[model samples]
Structures are given as structure tokens and as C-alpha cells.
Target chain A: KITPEELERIAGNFKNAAGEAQSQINRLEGDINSLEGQWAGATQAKFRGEFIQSKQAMQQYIAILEGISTDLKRIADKFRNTDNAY
Target chain B: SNAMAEIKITPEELERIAGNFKNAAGEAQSQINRLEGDINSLEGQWAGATQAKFRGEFIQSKQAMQQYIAILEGISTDLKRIADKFRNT
Candidate 1:
């Protein structure tokens, strides 16, 4: 059976990974010039447009993951403090 | 002028650029594999509302990461195709 403590560990894994992924991506997004490079003009613009949107998808995923992680942590805490029902 | 609108680059340079995109696609694939492993570990012994909620939350990760890989691979493929055209012309 999955224990609350184990769930807390899983939540920590997610929190770490979520933070790591978001940090890496935000840093990547910070430099548009390096990404687009010499590949300029409308074609580059089209690619950039799609790339930016895809990046937003990643950002959204990270947010979702973090939210889940937080929720899982909350669940674990509730389970751990079962005696709070005094 | 159309000529002014174009930027000159050697085939070697463009190939290198295209390869960079391909590398990023591979990176996304690695994340997909890792995250799948993450969920697989949950299924066997996991049950209850926690499992259901966690799975529901995680559901979007797959599609979003897959899209990331697809878009990056498409960019790489098209850039490589452009490199081919440049070579031919």
C-alpha cells in the first residue's frame, strides 16, 4: 500500500523536477536572439511564433506539475496528521 | 530587394543549425521517457482518490511533452530541407 510518507517523497520529486524544468526553460526563453540567430525574416518569425507558443505549453505543464505536487503534499500532510480530528 | 531580404549562409552552417534543433527534440524525448517512468511507478500499488487525482493532474504532461518533441523535430526536418535546397541551388 502507498503510504502518506511515500507520497510526500513523490511530491518532493515533482517539486524538484518542476522547479528545475521551469528554471531551465525560462533561461532558454530569455535569449530570443541566440535562438533565432541569423535565421531571420518571415520564416524565422513563423518559427519563432510557434516556438514561443510551444514554450508556453511547457510553462503551463510546469505550473500544472507544481500544482499537483503541492496538492499531493497537502494530501500527505492531512493523512499524516490524522489525529487532528480530536 | 529579394536579395536584400535573404541572408547568406553556407550549407555546413545550416546543417549544424538544423542538427541543433534535432538535438533539442532528442532532449524532449528524454524528458518524455523520464516522466513516463515516473507514472509507471505509480500504477502497481497506487489506489484511491490520491491516485485518481494525481493521474488526472499528470495526464496533460504527456500531450504537452509530445507536442514539444513534434514541433522541435518538425523544425529540425524543415531546416534540414532548407539546407538541401541551398545545396541544390
Candidate 2:
């Protein structure tokens, strides 16, 4: 049987990993620079355009994950309080 | 004899789970906002900036964006794993 204490432990693991992941994201943003310089216009467009799509996809996934995490926490909370009511 | 397994969770733990994921999502959104400005600035340069300037900037910007994407992918995968774990429950 998994007790409330054990479930809490599992949630803690998820939270720790989430924090680390966000930190890495911030670091990546800090390292980025603007795209401005001398080069072939067409080639520059190709790179930037590809990046735009990829970034958008990444954003979408993050939002989905956020929703899932919130739901999981809600369930966990419900189960936790149930035991207390008894 | 037959055996059964039971699972339990607590409110505090749920709060932690929610808080962590919420924070992670918040950061991801913030990065997207930041990237939007970068993309816009790059677009403006493409229209009026010199080839030499745009070229150099493009290379750096592309590299950085790629890195950012990779990091986001990592976080996404981690979140997926957590979600999957709870899905079965």
C-alpha cells in the first residue's frame, strides 16, 4: 500500500526536477543573441524560420505539461484529505 | 491467498507537485515571450539591416535558439514522464 507520506515523496521528486529544468531554460535564454549581421538573405531566412517553428512547438508542449502537473496535484490532494476525513 | 496494493497521497504533496510544474511552465512561457522579441528584431533586420550585419547576427541567433529549443525539449520529456506515472493511477 502507498501511504500519503509515500505519495508526497513522489511529488517532491517531480517538483525538484521541474525546478532544475526551469533553471536550465533560463540559462539558455541568457545565452541567446539577436540575429543581425552580414550574410546571404535567403540563408539567414532559412535558419531563423526553422527556429521559429521549433520554438513554437516547444512552447506548446510546456503548456500541456503544466496542465497535466496541475491535475495530478489536485488528485493527490484529494486522496490525502480523504484519509484525514476518516 | 490474494494480495492487493493501495496508494495514498497528501494535500501538501499535491501542492508541491502543482507548484513545481507551475513554476516550470511559467519559465517556459517567459522564454517564449523573450524569444518573440528576438524573432521580431531579426525580422526587422532582414528588411533593412546590411547583409554583413544580418549574416553574423543570424548565425549567433540561430545557434542560441537551437540551444533554447533543446532545453525546452528536455523539460517537456521530464514532464511527460511525471504525467505518465500518474495517468495509470
Candidate 3:
């Protein structure tokens, strides 16, 4: 039902996507830390606003990375299986 | 019209079920142990391995391994609970 593609190319894209998502999540985590510092220093309401947003953003990005990891493995295995089928 | 309800297992039957559960749990735990070992050995290598510009990729994998260990711990606990319920039987 599908055409053949190079395994390395497919795997590389998945890895790139996952790596980008992880980077964004790390950035959100950095923002969260700074915001926490603001809260401790007395701007509580502002910190709370940014904190929730940062946490949610990071979690969503993490979910994306998790999906990419699974996709990479699945695609790699499928290619291997197809190669072996002949 | 009479309706039939599902029958429940007797205490002795429960003991039998518990035995099976324990067996399955043991198998799962064995896998969990092996996976943990693999992760442990990998972590040792991962610590010094370079080239990943990002932090926590290895740590994330470690956390996933720990999550699996926690799942196995829960299975063992639940199986023990069943074993306890059938103690006198």
C-alpha cells in the first residue's frame, strides 16, 4: 500500500522533530523558573499567570516528543520488516 | 421470567485465581527487573557520552524506566493483596 523510502531519511526527520519539541519544552521550563523567582520576590499574581501557561506549554511539547519517539521507532521497524519480507 | 446473575468465585477458587495472578506478576516483575538493569547499565554509559546539545534526554529515558519499575511495584502489591485475601483458604 506504500512506496519504499530510505530508513535513515525517515528516522532523521522524526528525530529532528522530537529534538525541536524537547528544546521548546526546555525553554518553557526556563521561563517557569524565572517566573517563580518573581513570585517569591512579591509579584505573586503575575508569576501565577506565567507559571500555569509555562507548565501547560511544556507538557504539550513533551507529549509531542513522546509521539515522535514512538513514530520513529515504528517507522524504523516497519522498514526493517519490509526489507526482510522479500 | 427468572434472570441469572453472574456467579462469583468461592474462596478456594479465589486462591486459585490468586496463584495465577502471582505467577503473572512474577513474570512481569522479571521483565521490569531486566529493563531496569538495561537502563542502569545504559545510564552509566550515557553519563559520559557527549554530542547531545540538550539536557534530560537520557534523564527522560531513565525516568521512563523508573515509571516502569513503579508499575511493576504496583502489580506486585496488588498480587500480594490477593494472596493475603486467600490466606486462610
Candidate 4:
């Protein structure tokens, strides 16, 4: 368990990581979404399931960050109770 | 992130919900217009007594109804455009 300030710092990093990961997924999905009408409307044919697998992997990464978010939330609660400085 | 006042409803869902509101507003406007016609007919029944006051009030109420109905029409048309955009997207 990290300190409250440490948790806040980690939370910022987690948000950045989540956002970047999501952006990567969106970027890949954007390519796939654009190609949706091509190849008889088959994403598997267009992107070879690379984007789907990447997105699934991103979901796992997001779940890990969610766990961190839950932990950081608990640590932040300690700050609210004790008037701690970050 | 310090964020505030975020709305996240999809355009399709918003258009759908706005359609219901538009339908209710349209029905109310129809009733108001019908009442205005009824009041106009009544104006001829009592032409001499303080019926002038009634006519003035009815005219003002009808004007208000006209304004509201025009606004509702604008909303309905805008929602129609939104639904079209959502479908196209």
C-alpha cells in the first residue's frame, strides 16, 4: 500500500496510461472502423484481427488500472478524513 | 483532470427522447390552437359587453401559443436532422 500523496501521483500516471492505451485502441479501431465497408464489411479480412486482439489486450490493461483506481480511491479517502497535503 | 458539466448521451438516443417531448408539445399546441378557435367563435357571441377584454386576452394567448409552436417546430426539425446524421454516421 502506498501513501496518499503517492497514490495521487500514481493515479495521475494511471489516468495518463489509461488515456494513452485508450487512444491506441481508438486509433487502431478508427482504422478498422474506416475499413468496415471494405472487404465485404469484414474487419477480420481488413485488419487480420490484429486490432481486435490489441483491443482485447487493452481491456486487460484497463482492468489492471481499474484495480489501481480502486486502491487509489481508498487511499484518497484517507486524505479527505485527515486533511493531508498532497 | 478537473472537469465539469459533461453530457454523454448518444445523438440517436437524444433525438429519440426529444421526439417524445416534441410529440407531447405538439399535442398541447394543437389543443391550444383548438381552444383559440373556440374563443374566437365565442367573441361573436358576446360582442358588446367586456368581450373586448376577452378578445385582447385571447389574441395575446394565441400569440404566445404561436411563438411556442414555432419554437417546438424548430426543435422537431433540428432533432430530425440529428437523427439523420446519426443514421449516416
Clash counts for the predictions, in order: 0, 13, 0, 0
Q: Residues A3-49, candidate 2, lDDT per residue (tens digit)? A: 44543554454344345444544443332212222223453364355
lDDT of 3 by residue, A27-83 (tens): 433533433422123433443454455345445445544553455456556656766
What TM-score does each of the candidates earn?
0.76, 0.37, 0.33, 0.40
Candidate 3 CAPRI classification by DockQ: incorrect
Residues B1-89, model 4: lDDT tens digits: 01212222345654664464366446546655554454454454433553465455445545544554454445456546655654554
| Local error of candidate 1 at residue B59 (angstroms) | 1.0
User: What is the lDDT for B60 in model 4?
Assistant: 55
What is each predicted model's overall lDDT from 0 to 1?
A: 0.68, 0.43, 0.41, 0.50
**DockQ of candidate model 3:** 0.03
Pairs that collide in candidate 3 are none
Better of 1 and 2 by DockQ: 1
Query: Per-model TM-score of chain A alone?
Result: 0.75, 0.61, 0.51, 0.65
Model 4 C-alpha lDDT per residue in residues A1-86, reported as the tens digit of each score:
33456546655655555565465446435534543433232423524354454456456645555454455557567766776456
* Best of the two (2, 4) by lDDT: 4
Deviating ranges (above 4 Å) for candidate 4: A1-86, B1-7, B47-49
Q: lDDT (0-100) at residue A70 of candidate 1?
A: 85
lDDT at A15 for candidate 3? 53
Residue B10 CA displacement from its true place in model 2, Å: 55
Local accuracy of candidate 1 as per-residue lDDT tens digits, B8-51: 65566667766766776676677657766665677866456656
Tens-digit per-residue lDDT, B1-89, candidate 3? 01212222234443443344344435434533443343343333322442131224534543543443343334335434544554534
CA shift of A56, model 3, Å:
2.0
